[PDB]
Amino acid sequence: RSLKKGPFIDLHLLKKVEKAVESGDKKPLRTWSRRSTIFPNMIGLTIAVHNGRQHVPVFVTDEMVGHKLGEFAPTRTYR
Amino acid sequence: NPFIRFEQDKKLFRNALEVEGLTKGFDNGPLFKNLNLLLEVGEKLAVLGTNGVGKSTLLKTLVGDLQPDSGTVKWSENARIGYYAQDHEYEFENDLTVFEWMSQWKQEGDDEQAVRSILGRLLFSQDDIKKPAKVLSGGEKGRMLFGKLMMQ
Amino acid sequence: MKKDIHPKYEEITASCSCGNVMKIRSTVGHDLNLDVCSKCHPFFTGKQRDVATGGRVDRFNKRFNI
Amino acid sequence: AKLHDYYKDEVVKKLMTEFNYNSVMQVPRVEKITLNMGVGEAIADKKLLDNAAADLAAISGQKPLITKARKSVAGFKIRQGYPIGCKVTLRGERMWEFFERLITIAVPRIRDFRGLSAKSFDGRGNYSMGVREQIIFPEIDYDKVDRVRGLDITITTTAKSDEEGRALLAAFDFPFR
Amino acid sequence: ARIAGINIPDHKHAVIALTSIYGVGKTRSKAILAAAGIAEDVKISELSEGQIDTLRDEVAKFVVEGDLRREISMSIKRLMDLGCYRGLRHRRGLPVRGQRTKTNARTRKGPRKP
RNA sequence: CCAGGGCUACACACGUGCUACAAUGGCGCAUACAAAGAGAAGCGACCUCGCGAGAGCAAGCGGACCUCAUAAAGUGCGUCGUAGUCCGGAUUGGAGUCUGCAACUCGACUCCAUGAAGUCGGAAUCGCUAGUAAUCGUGGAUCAGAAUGCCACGGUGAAUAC
RNA sequence: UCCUCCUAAAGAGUAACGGAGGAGCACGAAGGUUGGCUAAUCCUGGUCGGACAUCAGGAGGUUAGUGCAAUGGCAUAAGCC
Ligand SMILES: Nc1ncnc2c1ncn2[C@@H]1O[C@H](COP(=O)(O)OP(=O)(O)OP(=O)(O)O)[C@@H](O)[C@H]1O
Ligand SMILES: [Mg+2]
Ligand SMILES: [Mg+2]
Ligand SMILES: [Mg+2]
Ligand SMILES: [Mg+2]
Ligand SMILES: [Mg+2]
Ligand SMILES: [Mg+2]
Ligand SMILES: [Mg+2]
Ligand SMILES: [Mg+2]
Ligand SMILES: [Mg+2]
Ligand code: NA
Ligand code: NA
């Protein structure tokens, strides 16, 4: 919920998705920027989100284009 | 010893009844003069007085079958009334089998397995549930109305 | 039939909001006014337009004022 | 009725031309419509059998026969003779007019209308249909309803092959897919 | 009266009898009456059919019981099969907006059980 | 030294609190009566825009003058007539605003919709002797933002002590 | 004490502390007559509906039914209205 400034994405991840769409699909990208929103352009990649100790790979899809990256990586376990 | 127990499906709060200025009389005029009362929840009201006076016809007005001269009777919102009339012949003039007569009042959520349980607790065993409802004893009929109140 | 155990059956004037005037016999005893019929049913367009909610990319791009 | 005349004027010629018959009697025709309401829980609530009978007599202007159980099955705790459901058989002009006032107004009113399946055939030329609710018919004023019961329609025709029975129902503007 | 599902309550001021629709609250109810020219104080019983007719169509602008009860059902179902964090909370019946589950949260947990 | 996570985890138990369960009350309109305190990368009038949280320009003030800042219970009229209710506000979906590099885990507030438990609480147990108890609002420290806690101020204002 | 089957050797009968089961009733209809009707079991299509309920077709053929144990019967039905 970041008002009228537009959607926020870390710079080091903006180039990572940009330089990856050029060459197609590759190995999952490793990122710690959980706070970065999912732009429509990074659909189809498997960016790996760091939930504290391990990187979980999320397959970006059409419906997941408004939620932040960390929304899809549970950071604590239970049972 | 029959096992009778009345329960209550939806308990209601605050006042259960209110009667405001219920003067009424047939041909003596003041059968009961300027009645005014408010009946709470959990009351066990015993209406006494004995003979020819409106000892009944109060209950008949409260249920509504005897229109009052003046006044208004406001039952509670969800008030469901089980009536056991003093003279109850009209509900047995029709000649149904005891089983069908008790099954008339089965509610939403019970079987004729649960219908016959009331008769069993009321001591109608296997043949006395085949008699016509017309031919029954006075006590065996009062019990059969108790089992309709319990069922409702 | 079997001597007046069935319900009454008389002709009624069933008419749609768009017309579709039909003279049928039915177990109502009173005329009815209802929606469209199969004559003008949107079967070629209702299921085409049934899907309306979906697609978050245009919702994201509509907010893109920056 | 109107649909009977429609059939005997147009569909006979259409289907004779299509299937290369030689006699008017060879082209199939609707024989009867069977409507049933299997309440199942009649034993749970017998007066719901009377409610269902009223609903089905409203849907079609014929009193329902109350069918009885045939075999004592221990899967649902019912025995021989126990009433289970209601049924009505429609033939002739009442059949034709019920068919008409189904097709024209009852079918379009179903919620989430997709289209009646063409594979709902018995391999001899008969059709079966579930409606999921009776409010879809105009015979209920939202007053008799305490359940959301539905009908089973079975169109029984004198057709011999399923492809033969398909075209007959198609020619009556049936809401197929 | 009779509006989308049922506007059964009579003897209620129309501004409030309309609340009984799944989707019509207080300020959305007041917009309906104001955009149709009916006074708030007027009871539904006093409300003649001459203005109920323009009341049935007024509610059609906004979503109502039949559509809304599914419109939100898709929204909850959208999260659960998406696998989002808010979807995970919905599956287990735990608070979704990030609040105390240590001792409170009996509304979403349910009755207290051992 | 750094990035991300945790202290916010949830079958459960306990302590201290806030809001209620309504009619000596809820809501709408109108109109009275305070004390104390804070402010310079700070408080920020008036005007315009927005249903609203707020936004744009922007005077005054390191101050008995300027701002935060409209006290609320109350009073007058109207409606609701004992219902899970025009009580209650949890929970949830959608749409936002503002701080802040950044609001997913994990902020506050606003708008539309849904509207739960709750109809005076078992054994038991706590506070209070007068401007006290009860209730009603106001401010400050901490602080970029973030209190129902803590500290502080006033309004109405009791019962009883053999 | 009575009933049914096997031992019982293709008429009847035939024993054992031989092998197996039943009876000490029921029904004013479950008796009489007249008129009609035909089952079990799966195979295909449908609201709750499910392996099994009711519906509609087809195969099947009496593999069902008989107030009560077994044997012999029963469609012209002795079975069901
Ligand atoms: N149906 C009626 N028609 C005419 N007059 C009636 C009727 N019912 C009652 N009354 C009159 O009203 C009077 C009131 O009778 P009510 O039923 O109150 O008596 P009661 O005290 O209940 O009698 P009891 O104990 O003898 O049954 C009667 O005595 C009679 O005069
Ligand atoms: Mg802590
Ligand atoms: Mg100062
Ligand atoms: Mg409750
Ligand atoms: Mg021999
Ligand atoms: Mg011999
Ligand atoms: Mg011899
Ligand atoms: Mg016999
Ligand atoms: Mg015979
Ligand atoms: Mg015989
Ligand atoms: Na009496
Ligand atoms: Na007697």
Automatic annotation (TrEMBL), chain D:
Q: Where is the Large ribosomal subunit protein uL5 C-terminal domain?
A: 83-176
Q: Which residues form the Large ribosomal subunit protein uL5 N-terminal domain?
A: 23-79
A single GO BP annotation from the record?
Answer: translation
**What's in the keyword line of the UniProt record?**
Acetylation, Ribonucleoprotein, Ribosomal protein, RNA-binding, rRNA-binding, tRNA-binding
* One Gene Ontology term, aspect cellular component: ribonucleoprotein complex
Which SUPFAM superfamilies does its entry note? RL5-like
A Pfam family per the record: Ribosomal_L5_C
Q: Report the domain of life of the source organism.
A: Bacteria
Name positions with the PTM N6-acetyllysine: K2
Coiled-coil region(s): none
Q: Output the Gene3D superfamilies linked to this UniProt entry.
A: 3.30.1440.10
Q: Which PROSITE patterns match?
A: RIBOSOMAL_L5
Q: Which GO terms describe its molecular function?
A: rRNA binding; structural constituent of ribosome; tRNA binding
Q: What is the annotated role of this protein in its UniProt record?
A: This is 1 of the proteins that bind and probably mediate the attachment of the 5S RNA into the large ribosomal subunit, where it forms part of the central protuberance. In the 70S ribosome it contacts protein S13 of the 30S subunit (bridge B1b), connecting the 2 subunits; this bridge is implicated in subunit movement. Contacts the P site tRNA; the 5S rRNA and some of its associated proteins might help stabilize positioning of ribosome-bound tRNAs.
Q: Which PANTHER family match?
A: 60S RIBOSOMAL PROTEIN L11-RELATED
**Description of how the protein assembles with itself and partners:** Part of the 50S ribosomal subunit; part of the 5S rRNA/L5/L18/L25 subcomplex. Contacts the 5S rRNA and the P site tRNA. Forms a bridge to the 30S subunit in the 70S ribosome.
Q: Which family does it belong to?
A: Belongs to the universal ribosomal protein uL5 family.
Full protein name: Large ribosomal subunit protein uL5
- The species this protein belongs to is Escherichia coli O145:NM
From TrEMBL, chain E:
One Pfam match: Ribosomal_S13
Keywords in UniProt for this one? Ribonucleoprotein, Ribosomal protein, RNA-binding, rRNA-binding, tRNA-binding
What function does the entry list? Located at the top of the head of the 30S subunit, it contacts several helices of the 16S rRNA. In the 70S ribosome it contacts the 23S rRNA (bridge B1a) and protein L5 of the 50S subunit (bridge B1b), connecting the 2 subunits; these bridges are implicated in subunit movement. Contacts the tRNAs in the A and P-sites.
InterPro entries per record: Rbsml_uS13_C, Ribosomal_uS13, Ribosomal_uS13-like_H2TH, Ribosomal_uS13_bac-type, Ribosomal_uS13_CS
Family named by the database record: Belongs to the universal ribosomal protein uS13 family.
What GO cellular component entries does it have? cytosol; small ribosomal subunit
* Record lineage: Bacteria, Pseudomonadati, Pseudomonadota, Gammaproteobacteria, Enterobacterales
Disordered: annotated span? 93-114
* SUPFAM superfamilies, A to Z: S13-like H2TH domain
Task: Give the protein name, as stated in the record.
Answer: Small ribosomal subunit protein uS13
What binding partners and quaternary form does the record give?
Answer: Part of the 30S ribosomal subunit. Forms a loose heterodimer with protein S19. Forms two bridges to the 50S subunit in the 70S ribosome.
Name a GO molecular-function annotation: structural constituent of ribosome
Q: Which GO terms describe its biological process?
A: translation
What is the organism of origin for this protein? Escherichia coli KTE182
The reply to whether Isomerase figures as a keyword in the UniProt entry is no
